[PDB]
Amino acid sequence: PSIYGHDHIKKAILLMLMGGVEKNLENGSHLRGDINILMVGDPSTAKSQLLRFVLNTASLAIATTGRGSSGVGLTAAVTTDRETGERRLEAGAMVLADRGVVCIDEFDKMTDVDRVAIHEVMEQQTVTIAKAGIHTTLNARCSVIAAANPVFGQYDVNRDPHQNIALPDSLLSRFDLLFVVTDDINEIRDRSISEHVLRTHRYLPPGYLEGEPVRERLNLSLAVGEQAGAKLAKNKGNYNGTEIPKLVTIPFLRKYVQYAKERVIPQLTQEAINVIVKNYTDLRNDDNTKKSPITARTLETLIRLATAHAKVRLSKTVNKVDAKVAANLLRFALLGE
Amino acid sequence: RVTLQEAPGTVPPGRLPRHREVILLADLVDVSKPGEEVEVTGIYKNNYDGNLNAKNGFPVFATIIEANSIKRREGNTANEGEEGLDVFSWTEEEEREFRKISRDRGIIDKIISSMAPSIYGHRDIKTAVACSLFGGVPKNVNGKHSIRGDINVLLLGDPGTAKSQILKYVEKTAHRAVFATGQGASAVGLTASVRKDPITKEWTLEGGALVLADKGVCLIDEFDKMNDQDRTSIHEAMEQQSISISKAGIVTTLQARCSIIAAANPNGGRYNSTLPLAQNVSLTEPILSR
Amino acid sequence: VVRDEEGGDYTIEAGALMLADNGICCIDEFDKMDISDQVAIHEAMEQQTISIAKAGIHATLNARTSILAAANPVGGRYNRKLSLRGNLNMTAPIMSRFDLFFVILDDCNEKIDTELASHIVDLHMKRDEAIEPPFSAEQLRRYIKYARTFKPILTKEARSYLVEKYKELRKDDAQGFSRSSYRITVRQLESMIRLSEAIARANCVDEITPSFIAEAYDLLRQSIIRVDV
Amino acid sequence: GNLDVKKALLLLLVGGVDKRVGDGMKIRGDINVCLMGDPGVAKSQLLKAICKISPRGVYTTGKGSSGVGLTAAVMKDPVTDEMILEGGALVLADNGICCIDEFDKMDESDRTAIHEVMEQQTISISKAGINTTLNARTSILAAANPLYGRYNPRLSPLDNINLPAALLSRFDILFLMLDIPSRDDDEKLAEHVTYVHMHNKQPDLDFTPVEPSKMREYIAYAKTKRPVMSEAVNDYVVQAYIRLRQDSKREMDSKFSFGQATPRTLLGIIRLSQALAKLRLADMVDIDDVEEALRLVRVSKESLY
Amino acid sequence: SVLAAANPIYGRYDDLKSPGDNIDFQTTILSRFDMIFIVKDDHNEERDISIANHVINIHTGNANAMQNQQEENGSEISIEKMKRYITYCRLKCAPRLSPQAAEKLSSNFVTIRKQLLINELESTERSSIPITIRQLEAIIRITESLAKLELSPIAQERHVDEAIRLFQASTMDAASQDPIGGTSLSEIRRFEQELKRRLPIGWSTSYQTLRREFVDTHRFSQLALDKALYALEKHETIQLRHQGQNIYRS
Amino acid sequence: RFDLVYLVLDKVDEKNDRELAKHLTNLYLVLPVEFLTMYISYAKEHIHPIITEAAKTELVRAYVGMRKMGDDSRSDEKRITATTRQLESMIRLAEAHAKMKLKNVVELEDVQEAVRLIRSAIKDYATDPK
DNA sequence: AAAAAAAAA
Numbered sequence A: 001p002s003i004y005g006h007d008h009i010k011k012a013i014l015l016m017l018m019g020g021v022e023k024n025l026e027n028g029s030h031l032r033g034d035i036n037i038l039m040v041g042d043p044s045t046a047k048s049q050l051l052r053f054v055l056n057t058a059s060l061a062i063a064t065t066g067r068g069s070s071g072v073g074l075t076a077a078v079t080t081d082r083e084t085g086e087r088r089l090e091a092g093a094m095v096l097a098d099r100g101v102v103c104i105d106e107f108d109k110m111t112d113v114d115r116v117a118i119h120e121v122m123e124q125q126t127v128t129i130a131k132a133g134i135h136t137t138l139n140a141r142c143s144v145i146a147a148a149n150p151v152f153g154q155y156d157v158n159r160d161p162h163q164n165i166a167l168p169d170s171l172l173s174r175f176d177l178l179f180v181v182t183d184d185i186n187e188i189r190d191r192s193i194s195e196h197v198l199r200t201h202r203y204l205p206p207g208y209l210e211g212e213p214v215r216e217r218l219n220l221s222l223a224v225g226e227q228a229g230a231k232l233a234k235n236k237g238n239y240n241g242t243e244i245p246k247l248v249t250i251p252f253l254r255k256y257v258q259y260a261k262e263r264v265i266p267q268l269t270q271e272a273i274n275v276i277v278k279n280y281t282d283l284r285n286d287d288n289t290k291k292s293p294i295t296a297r298t299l300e301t302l303i304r305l306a307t308a309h310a311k312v313r314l315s316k317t318v319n320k321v322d323a324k325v326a327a328n329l330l331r332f333a334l335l336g337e
Numbered sequence B: 001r002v003t004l005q006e007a008p009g010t011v012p013p014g015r016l017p018r019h020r021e022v023i024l025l026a027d028l029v030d031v032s033k034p035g036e037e038v039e040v041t042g043i044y045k046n047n048y049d050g051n052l053n054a055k056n057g058f059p060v061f062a063t064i065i066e067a068n069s070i071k072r073r074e075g076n077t078a079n080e081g082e083e084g085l086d087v088f089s090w091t092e093e094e095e096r097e098f099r100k101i102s103r104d105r106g107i108i109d110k111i112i113s114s115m116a117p118s119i120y121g122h123r124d125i126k127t128a129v130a131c132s133l134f135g136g137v138p139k140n141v142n143g144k145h146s147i148r149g150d151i152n153v154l155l156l157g158d159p160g161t162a163k164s165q166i167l168k169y170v171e172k173t174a175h176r177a178v179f180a181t182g183q184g185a186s187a188v189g190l191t192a193s194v195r196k197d198p199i200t201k202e203w204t205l206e207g208g209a210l211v212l213a214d215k216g217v218c219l220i221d222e223f224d225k226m227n228d229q230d231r232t233s234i235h236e237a238m239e240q241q242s243i244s245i246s247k248a249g250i251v252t253t254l255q256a257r258c259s260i261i262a263a264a265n266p267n268g269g270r271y272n273s274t275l276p277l278a279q280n281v282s283l284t285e286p287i288l289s290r
Numbered sequence C: 001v002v003r004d005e006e007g008g009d010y011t012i013e014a015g016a017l018m019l020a021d022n023g024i025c026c027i028d029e030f031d032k033m034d035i036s037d038q039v040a041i042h043e044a045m046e047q048q049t050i051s052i053a054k055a056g057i058h059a060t061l062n063a064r065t066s067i068l069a070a071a072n073p074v075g076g077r078y079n080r081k082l083s084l085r086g087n088l089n090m091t092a093p094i095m096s097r098f099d100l101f102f103v104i105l106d107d108c109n110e111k112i113d114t115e116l117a118s119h120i121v122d123l124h125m126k127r128d129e130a131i132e133p134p135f136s137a138e139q140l141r142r143y144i145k146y147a148r149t150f151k152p153i154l155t156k157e158a159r160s161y162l163v164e165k166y167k168e169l170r171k172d173d174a175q176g177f178s179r180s181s182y183r184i185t186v187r188q189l190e191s192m193i194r195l196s197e198a199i200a201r202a203n204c205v206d207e208i209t210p211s212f213i214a215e216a217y218d219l220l221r222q223s224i225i226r227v228d229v
Numbered sequence D: 001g002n003l004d005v006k007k008a009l010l011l012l013l014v015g016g017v018d019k020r021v022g023d024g025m026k027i028r029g030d031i032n033v034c035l036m037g038d039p040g041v042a043k044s045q046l047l048k049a050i051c052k053i054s055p056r057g058v059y060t061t062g063k064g065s066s067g068v069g070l071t072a073a074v075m076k077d078p079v080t081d082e083m084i085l086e087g088g089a090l091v092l093a094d095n096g097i098c099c100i101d102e103f104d105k106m107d108e109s110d111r112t113a114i115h116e117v118m119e120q121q122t123i124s125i126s127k128a129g130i131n132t133t134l135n136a137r138t139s140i141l142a143a144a145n146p147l148y149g150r151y152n153p154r155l156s157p158l159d160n161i162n163l164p165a166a167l168l169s170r171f172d173i174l175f176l177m178l179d180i181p182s183r184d185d186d187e188k189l190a191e192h193v194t195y196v197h198m199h200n201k202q203p204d205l206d207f208t209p210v211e212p213s214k215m216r217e218y219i220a221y222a223k224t225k226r227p228v229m230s231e232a233v234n235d236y237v238v239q240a241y242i243r244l245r246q247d248s249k250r251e252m253d254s255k256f257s258f259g260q261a262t263p264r265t266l267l268g269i270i271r272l273s274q275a276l277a278k279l280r281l282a283d284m285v286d287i288d289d290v291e292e293a294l295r296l297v298r299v300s301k302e303s304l305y
Numbered sequence E: 001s002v003l004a005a006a007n008p009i010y011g012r013y014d015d016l017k018s019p020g021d022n023i024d025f026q027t028t029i030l031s032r033f034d035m036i037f038i039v040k041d042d043h044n045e046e047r048d049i050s051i052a053n054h055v056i057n058i059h060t061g062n063a064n065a066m067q068n069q070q071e072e073n074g075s076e077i078s079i080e081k082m083k084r085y086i087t088y089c090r091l092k093c094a095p096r097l098s099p100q101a102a103e104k105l106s107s108n109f110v111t112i113r114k115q116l117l118i119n120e121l122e123s124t125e126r127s128s129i130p131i132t133i134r135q136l137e138a139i140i141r142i143t144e145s146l147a148k149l150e151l152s153p154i155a156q157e158r159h160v161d162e163a164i165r166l167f168q169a170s171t172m173d174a175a176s177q178d179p180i181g182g183t184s185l186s187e188i189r190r191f192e193q194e195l196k197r198r199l200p201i202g203w204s205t206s207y208q209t210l211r212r213e214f215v216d217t218h219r220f221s222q223l224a225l226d227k228a229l230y231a232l233e234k235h236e237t238i239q240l241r242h243q244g245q246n247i248y249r250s
Numbered sequence F: 001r002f003d004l005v006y007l008v009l010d011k012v013d014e015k016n017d018r019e020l021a022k023h024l025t026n027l028y029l030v031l032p033v034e035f036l037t038m039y040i041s042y043a044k045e046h047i048h049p050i051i052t053e054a055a056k057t058e059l060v061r062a063y064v065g066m067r068k069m070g071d072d073s074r075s076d077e078k079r080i081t082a083t084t085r086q087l088e089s090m091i092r093l094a095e096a097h098a099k100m101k102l103k104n105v106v107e108l109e110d111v112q113e114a115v116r117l118i119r120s121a122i123k124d125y126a127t128d129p130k
Numbered sequence G: 001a002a003a004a005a006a007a008a009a
Ligand SMILES: Nc1ncnc2c1ncn2[C@@H]1O[C@H](COP(=O)(O)OP(=O)(O)OP(=O)(O)O)[C@@H](O)[C@H]1O
Pocket: A002, A003, A004, A005, A042, A043, A044, A045, A046, A047, A048, A049, A149, A193, A197, E028, E133, E134, E137
């Protein structure tokens, strides 16, 4: 709630945390099931903060930076055991994050060589290690979110999108959604964001006075821990009243996503298929300038987003409204409003 | 105990050096320093060894040298004027003679004229070299302000002006002198370097060229051609008189009290008298002001 | 300087100049040297020493050598219109290092090439061992080793003639132009002294006659006659 | 869609003319075809399909794994560190089907390895006095893209593969897959993909009387028959080569300059006619096979535009 | 906290050169920093005399006495007492803002953002020193640090004004210094002829009348003010007095 | 510094392409044995031929002839194409020709063969001018 | 086996 704007970024994050279902076939091998989001923008536009929020609110996630990591040790390492005296593999950065989400900062500043590891993993969600007589395929079906800044200090709107991004096209084509953020100078928005940020910094922890700094505390009183339906104490979530629309607390949202990721596996119908194919054809043959080229992968992204939105409303079938909202989100992420 | 190799100046060209072991008893501890060429007078002795016999298969014995006298021979190769373990030590009568001859009128002129007696002219260069190798006084204000007390000298001019001969004489007469030249010196070679010890297997500090110049003079030839990355690593040595390293988990600061004397050549090989100094050399103000 | 990967060698390897100590180094094709050697040579030549300080090892190696080199003019053929500086690509400080220059040209004259081909053929088949030198190799080595054991000196008239010659050589070249001709330094006087001493050694005389000074001056002057022509 | 590439793969699975000629001159029955196309054309998916359906298929790439190129799999393997080694060898290079994605990615070592494997040449790289050469006889499958990732209106050899032209001339068939935005084709592609997704299975929209194991048996059956050549087509192939050299007379017209002169073009068309006699026909080589090979070459060049 | 020292390209700042190519740091790294000080050398011989006297006295023969008096008259405190005081203040106090201070901060941020937009629009290139929300957070932290000096639980206008002054110094010194970087100059000559022709030495005209006439002609308002203050900067024969109304020609 | 150089230029013509097509198709549808190797060994190590005085005149005449071509009716100082490398080329080639056929002294045919062989390569060394 | 510093291309 403390991040102003970035509405569709929040919507994409919500769809990503509880993405679509994985499809497997006896003849079609494997179909990717989750969604990846990449953000590029000029400095001080709240990308690292949103990434930290996603790290905090996710059920399972691993924090990683581009410069402080090495691709060889990021997937698997060979070390000797002190007791037995043999050598055994150690899980890497994203192997620990299997079925989770991996967040990487300074993505463009990472060494090019290590990027091949991502090229290995994001391709088929499986890393294969073959070194010192060890032959094993390790499963890693994680989703990766990255944030990188353009080559220049600030984004150039009048320049080619390709020359503004240091990353090669091969990896950029894999990411489903590309988001560009700029801090356009406008006195109205400057005043609004200024009063919002000043509101944020005037906050006091409950039950604690303002004259002394924040002090550490002890653990919970219990070493081990553990009327119905009439309370709605932490259900409604509107802890403080500042706007007419509702708001929900974080733990209930985590409970909601936990329930949704397990109890619901939706299926699609022909009504959404018609909208998907129609909007794909219209987007492909509009013949106007666009930020990124499209291909058959974008339609598969639309299908995965439609499945994710069929999951978000707790329904077993895909409604055409999900196709419409997915098309609108894609059109924003590729054209802009 | 210390390992003694062969001096590269006396080894046959293209061959390999020979190693021996030297043992230092009391009053000889820490006299020698790594990287410093020395001359040791000692006693040759032999002792039994087991593994050495095992590897060679013959009754071979190990040999060591126990030191009895050490004489430093770094830089000052001129070793014919006088004898002794050290040539920079004075007796009481020599102190008396110093005091007797230090009071006569116009001793500054005699000192200046007695330096490099085989070079004609260049009085200003001789005066500058004397003032640079005599040095000043470092200042410490309340233990909280530091003022450098050594003088740097830069030489510049046309070829065939015997700058290198002056540098050689300065190296000969100084107590602690180190000679570097052209591109043959790197940025990390002049300053301190970090190295992994092959035996104990952890990072350690290796004394650089400037560290050997403490209480002494560091001489550089062909200063202009030296690459900028190899030239920007001595700013602290000139001004701050300290070397700081933060590498491989080691955070230490090394003191360095050295005077830098450099020689170079202008653009085009000759000095254009009708142009300012800014258009004669490619050096900038941060290096020129020091 | 070479060191083993994670190895405690930190040893130096000797270049051709280092191996040629107390001898003659014969470098061929001087033109395509690189910057490091191109700036190390004019320190190795004049000061007869090489100094290095890299990666924690410092040393001053002895490089007492007598160098002889060959080169090819830029463009292939020597252009008689221009001078030595115009044709060669070497730097001005390197030229001052050398003590003598020899420029040799080929031509299309029919009288010379026939003699050259005949002499090549004769040595190839007819008289492959029957060449006619005035003295044998062993006699040459004996005389050279006998003459190397002499140290000539200089007399009063030799000094006066030498200073007069140096003054004349400094004056006449500086009369040409300013900021375009700069070729005579004290190194030229030292070269005259060395060449006179060598010529005195050749005749096995403990003293030096001004005729030797005149011959050395003639050599150094025709080194400048060539650059004019 | 993409019937041409599937037909080329089928003709590849049988193999060209082989087992030498008179006097011992070397001829290789393996066909070397390269696939050109922008990202997002499922050439990698088709490569995975052909690798899965071919028992001898192997997939490699530029680095990622180091013990795959220029070295065998038995390096420093035994507990005694006996250093068992053959020297210069590849992965199952004998009668194998090497498949590579991102054929512009690999470093100089693997590129030199391919330059060593050109035209069934043995691998003779030695390190410690070993000369146990591996008799490499394999077909080459290469999929790559121009480093710009898209086609350009300018001169087409400027894109090519960003690889030396000597390697390019080695290959038998070059096929280009250019993504052209069209409503009447992208509509069908989208409908087929979404119908595949809807059923969560292979759709009944397809109509194939043959099955993967069925053709797995039939490829071996057709390779067993092994027809031999016929003489009456020599004049036809000679005049075809003459008109190909006539085309080379116009290679300076440029903008699709790939129509260059090479005797390996004649060798490849002979091999493709042999394969077009091998795949279905009995011990007989027909002129229609030469005609079909010529049409395949023309269609392969046609995608340049 | 990071305290970094750096030198611009070409040694001295070389003010005649554009500010864009005197600093090689990217936009991203400069944003994290929030107090950028450009110390330039100057020559007027009075500050030079003062500095020479200061250094000459600070030579150890004299300073060893004078500084002692600074600890005897209570004008300064020793280093260790300052260390104890700073650790005590860091442990104890942690101030907080007030709504009036928040309003003043918001207004100041909007003002500086608009001024940056004006300078960018005139210059027609991206500014080498950016202004973002990080700068607003920086000013907030400066106000809080100023309030932390006196152990005040609440930060008020007295600290906010000084923090704003410090930020104004560190902004006008580096970011908004000579944004012009030195219609083109064809009008510049055309104006300067008119003032000499129509306005003799010693007389004066109102600013409003000159602006009116030159907006009536092709000159317009934007062109006039820039070279008006330029000719004032030249100060050879143009002087301002009596607020911004009297254009005196010296 | 090479002794010789050979250039191959495959250009599109009807006749040569037809001939290559026929020849390659016929191959697709008088040679000794290691005898060659032992003959070569015998020539290498038993045979040591020398040049005679008669061939010297022809060698000098050939050198002059390639010298005379190197200049023309203009004072432009045309390129010097007759180098001593050519001389070593012809002497070595003529001696090697006498090495073949197990002879002991050279004949004229050797020197004409050598000069023709070198000048055939030189005649194809010209650029677009001349 | 894997990380980090140095000289040469
Ligand atoms: N819309 C916003 N609402 C609240 N704070 C914001 C907003 N945009 C930026 N900020 C503030 O900008 C500051 C910069 O934070 P941060 O470095 O994480 O951002 P960023 O855009 O990811 O930067 P970078 O590209 O340098 O990593 C934060 O203190 C954050 O509070």
